[PDB]
């Protein structure tokens, strides 16, 4: 009421959740490869090895 | 309460008032205010905002 305003964030919580889900799927299905170039699939036990 | 004439918020501002002529209670809300922002491309590109 006295001239103070709060501005909404540019990225809504849904977009942040989508970003985190994308990162998690990438790290599950492709290991560390997708962080340094094209995403290459690999079975999860072999990635754990 | 019959004795109380005004009402204050948590942050020490008036929000409710009692009419003297008729024993009624009125919620006072400040008139709308905001910031005006102008969205515009480069003036060389166009002059629409």
From Swiss-Prot, chain A:
Mutating residue 2 to K: what's the consequence? In strain: Omicron/BA.1
Job description of the protein? Subunit of the fusion protein that is processed upon entry into the host cell. Mediates fusion of the virion and cellular membranes by functioning as a class I viral fusion protein. Contains a viral fusion peptide that is unmasked after S2 cleavage. This cleavage can occur at the cell membrane by host TMPRSS2 or during endocytosis by host CSTL. In either case, this triggers an extensive and irreversible conformational change that leads to fusion of the viral envelope with the cellular cytoplasmic membrane, releasing viral genomic RNA into the host cell cytoplasm.
Name this polypeptide is given: Spike protein S2'
Q: Which organism is it from?
A: Severe acute respiratory syndrome coronavirus 2
Recorded name of the encoding gene:
S
